[model samples]
Target: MVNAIRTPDQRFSNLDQYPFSPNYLDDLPGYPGLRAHYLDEGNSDAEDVFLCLHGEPTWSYLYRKMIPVFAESGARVIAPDFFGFGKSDKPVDEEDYTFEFHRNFLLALIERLDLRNITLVVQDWGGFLGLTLPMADPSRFKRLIIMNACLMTDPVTQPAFSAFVTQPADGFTAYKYDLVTPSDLRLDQFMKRWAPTLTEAEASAYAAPFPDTSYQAGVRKFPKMVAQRDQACIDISTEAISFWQNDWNGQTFMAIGMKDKLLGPDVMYPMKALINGCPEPLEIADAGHFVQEFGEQVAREALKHFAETE
Candidate 1:
């Protein structure tokens, strides 16, 4: 397999129909030569801004359903495809990826973009990465909405995850790309199912950024990072959780998929305790692990309400 870097020109052509334009923030000062990609939508002058972050095996495409609604409501919506996912550059070497590297990748984007008064809607690994960014610099954020996610340093130790980690390498990769999605859903099922809720072009546009497997390194690496629980990464997560517990000053909303076998409502109980105050948890009754697909409208409404009311 050839490990070639796709230039920005090459990547976005695969994603041109999406109304939002690609905004590439150049390498962070400290990190000499790394770039990140983000989708900029709605008016720049909009008073409220919504920041959407995705999790494992998915990209900003995960938020395709919520983007237009928020953008139409006069809110600025920005969803960035993390490094190695979506249209962003993917490091072909798995060893080059790390939790801290991913965290800093996001930090570099936010600092470069200079986003403020943000309402963060995060899920899965997004919860972990998103919350840590705000904790690092609370001034950048105003509110938070989390769904089917966690911000812990400890290994999950769930049987499902354990089974996933120990599988043969080929099986593990195939299962992630194939099985983790909904039952009858293939690569773009999430986008297609949300069609009734979104314009046909919009649905197709979301799938545009991810053209092939080479761009999926970040997605593949994400699960392994979670399973690694290396001392440095775990320590950072632990400290962030502790600091947020004792010092965070923002509001929180929890939305969970009750039927999610991977990170269901059960995980939220422990997650809530870490925040030091109880959060209003909403149950997406029919959704599974990838609840954002089935409950986009509900999730969007809940997040908008959380930002406005709480």
Candidate 2:
């Protein structure tokens, strides 16, 4: 059994702009005794399902602006907080968290829920892991809404993704430093620094899942994982590139957080080229690494584009 702790329920009470009810699953295969948290909104039987994934220290709350838009359009939305982030139970052991550990959770959730006609919305680590998922179950994923994310590939073969690791002075360097180094990493301050436009209340919500630093093992692991650039992660991501470039036939909408130095246009443009039929991207001039902060526009535009193309 994974040793984990559930955040106090009161920590999440009355979060601003986040009124969605909670849904839990403790019986998922391979995840014994750990309660996973997800927000299931919109029509339960809707033909379209938006699977929103958050990245690095953020949670489902990151998608507050976009969930309403997707639901209002009559699409079912599933935004899950990975094991250690948001309301999900945080495994105390950093070793319990791995590339496969989190990736498998997503695969298990999709099977358990039998979610189909998926429109995958991803950013940050969301893309690192999420962008590789369609190749596993291509029939289920019909579209992709990509923003400020790329596959985590190896230095030897995939140069675009390798730059994230090799570049010494890029934005992620300091960002990763801030995340893993501090014993008491304040997510609210971290969030505000990365996405400067967030309000005081909005930033605090990012820190809500962890009462203190003990709950931040998953947060620390992600950046270190980026630094390590594991071979398993690289192999899967490399395979995903071939899948996207040659086999993927889904409609796609690309959005870039222009102000984001972490995974900005430099990373996104190469990714755009790899996806078989990706069109020109929407550049959000004011947004930073947390593109979802400006997600209402991205969500609306993506839905419209899909509608027009469909």
Candidate 3:
């Protein structure tokens, strides 16, 4: 709010792969002048809101493939770019990218837009943060679309973004998303290494928001925020887990990309147990960490299951 740099709208232009119109909210309390961007698609009158959230180093653009399919149900889909990624304002000071910074922004945005009955869509950093919101007011949200992500912020369950700082070098660069050495920076090699099926344009869209190294402050720092495993997040996550297990009656749909080892089936299988009555996840063996790469199919099946169960 007080100080931040926004990615030029020009950078977001010609995103043919992302045809959904852009929406913004710059007036949330405590976060003035910060224009949080999102994609608001489908009927404005729809009863349900598909609140798609992306995690570290990624933004709402991550949900492009799944959005159209979800909106096909006449429900509204709202995917916002967190402050530090995509079209949202990027704070130069990495310290500004804390767990609460992002979490508070989400809470405020939800109120600002007055979004209701959300089908909380999450993966990666999105899950890490978005999952913690519901217990604050459990009745507001309706469903869950979880992917290759985790609820644990501990070392064993830290996000896949850790690789950004630790992965071996190539098109990507290592900057500590905090501090010490990362393993890899080979963007082309890494994305294709895991998501080999990604199209040329799709990969480019992933790289779009980050045209310059400086533009990546949020992308680089988001992982570290989680690694910090802030006591605040742990407390909230603990609360949410209890709520999910003991009281959350919402329908849950999990889609795991077996190719993702960082936060794949191993992490979610246990989480499924914690979620009262969460069924076996839909396993897409071919997909990788960015499970939404198969978003269309995933959305179709998710809608079908929700419908059948309803």
Using Cα atoms with residue i matched to residue i, what is each candidate's TM-score against the true structure? 0.78, 0.98, 0.88
Ranking by lDDT: 2, 3, 1
lDDT of 2 at 172: 83
lDDT of 3 by residue, 175-261 (tens): 232222333333333355556897766666666676666666676676556556678777777677787789888898999988764
**C-alpha RMSD (angstroms) for model 3:** 3.9
Question: Which model is ahead, 1 or 3, in terms of TM-score?
Answer: 3
What Cα-based lDDT does every candidate model obtain? 0.66, 0.92, 0.76
Model 3 per-residue lDDT at 130: 86
Model 1 stretches astray by more than 4 angstroms: 1-4, 7-17, 30-33, 155-213, 307-310
Q: Candidate 3: which stretches are off by over 4 Å? A: 153-190
lDDT at residue 192 of model 3 (Cα atoms): 55
Better of 2 and 3 by lDDT: 2
The most accurate candidate by TM-score is 2
